[PDB]
């Protein structure tokens, strides 16, 4: 469809003191395999990330306009941005086009800059925010993400069990759907330092 043209899926999950976020590496037009290097999860500040899924032009465009507004914001105020501020900012950015709405699925995963508090949120394409304490999923297929995540996620996890959890969720979530696949990258961040890995995904 419109959103499923380029395909793709983004998943973020809150750990104990940390937060995990992951997405597939694949790019392409419909059933055609194009390139597996494509980047979706983008850094904003430190100890905070953001994912995007949908049209790659809207992905890149939103990342650019967003990074613009953030740079002005933090240039004017020496503090780093808070996650809520970023949330309502992206919501404002998506509602600015009502009758000309972009096509994306913003997923924000980042810690509080003041404390270490973990935080996740996901929005609607016209700017409707949503916050959950377990995980926020956006992408092509439902039963895969919601299914495996509801079937797995636990309240308090070390970074390892969190890692393997979102890993199996993204693997078995991808392996049923053809438009998403071709490698998966996982970003797992904490207050102290950021850790990133690359899952081994079937290239089928």
């Amino acid at each position: 469809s419109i959103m499923s043209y380029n395909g793709g899926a983004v998943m973020a999950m809150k750990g104990k003191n940390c937060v995990a976020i992951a997405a597939d590496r694949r790019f392409g037009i419909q059933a055609q395999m194009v390139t597996t290097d494509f980047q979706k999860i983008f850094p904003m500040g430190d100890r905070l990330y953001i994912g995007l899924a949908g049209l790659a032009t809207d992905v890149q465009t939103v990342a650019q306009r967003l990074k613009f507004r953030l740079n002005l914001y933090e240039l004017k105020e020496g503090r780093q941005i808070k996650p809520y501020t970023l949330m309502s900012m992206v919501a404002n950015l998506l509602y600015e086009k009502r009758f000309g709405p972009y096509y994306t699925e913003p997923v924000i995963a980042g810690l509080d800059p003041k404390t270490f508090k973990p935080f996740i949120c996901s929005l609607d394409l016209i700017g409707c925010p949503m916050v959950t304490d377990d995980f926020v999923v956006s992408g092509t297929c439902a039963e895969q993400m919601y299914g495996m995540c509801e079937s797995l996620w636990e309240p308090n996890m070390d970074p390892d069990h969190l890692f393997e959890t979102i890993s199996q969720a993204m693997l078995n979530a991808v392996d049923r759907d053809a438009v998403s696949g071709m490698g998966v990258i996982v970003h797992i961040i904490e207050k102290d330092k950021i850790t990133t890995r690359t899952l081994k995904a079937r290239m089928d």
Binding site: K76, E77, Y84, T85, S88, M89, N92
Partner: protein
């Protein structure tokens, strides 16, 4: 208008701005007011006296709170004051609509400072004759800022605007210091505004707004006569 719009403010032989100097003089002829930033939060103490006992002070206020956490006072001319206050009142909102969050004192002074700046250079119109003292409490630490006709701003633990502000400024230099509680700041603010006050002081002769880190609050003449009774 007629589209003339030429800035009437040129540079003097020394480069000074004539009309801005004169507006600074008009502020100096303003009402005596003071504010103190210390410890728990900010305390703003102005002076409003009636030229005739017909006047009713329950009607118009010298203190117009921008948000529940941020108030404001002034010196100079109310006509301009009310105007730019309506302006900043409207202006904090856009910031809210964007972030859904109270606008920081620093950012208020930033945007209002720019409005006043361009307002000097704007086409064929005088600058303001108002110098603002803005209070606010954000992120646990309160803040006290001061504007000028040219748009520049500073920060003080205590200061004064209006007649004698140098004298009472030096009084606040020695006496006021450190960080002390709302009770102390109110005390010494009633002393320093008691300096240039008339022979009698009443609950309606002054106005005291306070910025707690729980949020800004405007005191009533009830508490004004309560603490000041027993003046200083």
């Amino acid at each position: 208008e007629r589209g003339y719009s030429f800035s009437l403010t040129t540079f003097s032989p020394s480069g000074k701005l004539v009309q801005i100097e004169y507006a600074l003089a008009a502020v100096a002829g303003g009402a005596p007011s003071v504010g103190i930033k210390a410890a728990n939060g900010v305390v703003l103490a102005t002076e409003k006296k009636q030229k005739s006992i017909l006047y009713d002070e329950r009607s118009v206020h010298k203190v117009e709170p921008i948000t529940k956490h941020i108030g404001l006072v002034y010196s100079g001319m109310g006509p301009d004051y009310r105007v730019l206050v309506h302006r900043a009142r409207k202006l904090a909102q856009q910031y809210y609509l964007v972030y859904q969050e109270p606008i920081p004192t620093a950012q208020l002074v930033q945007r209002v400072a720019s409005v006043m700046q361009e307002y000097t250079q704007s086409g064929g119109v005088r600058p303001f004759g108002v110098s603002l003292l803005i209070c606010g409490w954000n992120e646990g630490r309160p803040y006290l800022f001061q504007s000028d006709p040219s748009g520049a701003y500073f920060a003080w633990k205590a200061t004064a605007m209006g007649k004698n502000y140098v004298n009472g400024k030096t009084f606040l230099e020695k006496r006021y210091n450190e960080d002390l509680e709302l009770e102390d700041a109110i005390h010494t603010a009633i002393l320093t505004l008691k300096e240039s006050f008339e022979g009698q002081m009443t609950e309606d002769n002054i106005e005291v707004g306070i910025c707690n880190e729980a949020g800004f609050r405007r005191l009533t003449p009830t508490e004004v006569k309560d603490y000041l009774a027993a003046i200083a």
